[PDB]
């Protein structure tokens, strides 16, 4: 099993899941997120597919070791995250929205009106499509 941590981060990993599963590959890969979900963006990832049920846990070092890769949904958790990265598993981690090929943003952004919930999965069914393409491929390479 290949797996995905995602570190907002609820919806990630129920598109994520979706776009798994969506391309059958859901025996392949598991996804995970960390550092109830928002009732709101419940809601509205429901209306769209997505079922967004995770409860907030934190990240601990031992993510670093038994992930395969981890993505951050800012610039400010990616360089959170390399701080605090042992030196051997910092290429593990990832930018969401690099991966992304039709939006052109440079983070998710954080959904403050309230067609910022859809602006949001947009962006990480954009970039989560990528990623599983990606993923199939070989190595993550950036």
């Given at each position: 099993s290949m797996k995905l941590l995602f570190v907002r981060s609820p919806a990630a990993e129920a598109v994520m899941k979706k776009v798994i599963q969506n391309h059958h590959l859901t025996e392949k890969y598991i996804c995970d997120?960390?550092?109830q979900a928002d009732s709101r963006m419940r809601k509205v990832?429901?209306?769209?597919g997505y079922q967004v049920d995770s409860i907030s846990?934190?990240?601990?070092?031992?993510d670093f070791k038994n992930f395969?890769?981890?993505f951050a949904m800012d610039n400010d958790n990616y360089y959170?995250?390399?701080?605090?990265?042992?030196?051997?598993?910092?290429?593990?981690?990832?930018?969401?929205?690099?991966?992304?090929?039709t939006i052109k943003t440079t983070e998710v952004p954080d959904p403050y009106g309230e067609k910022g919930f859809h602006r949001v999965i947009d962006i990480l069914e954009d970039a989560?499509?990528?990623?599983?393409?990606?993923?199939?491929e070989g190595k993550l390479i950036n």
């Open positions: 997120s960390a550092g990832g429901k209306s769209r846990r934190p990240v601990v070092s031992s395969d890769y981890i959170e995250l390399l701080d605090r990265c042992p030196e051997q598993y910092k290429q593990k981690i990832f930018k969401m929205v690099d991966f992304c090929t989560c499509e990528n990623l599983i393409i990606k993923l199939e």
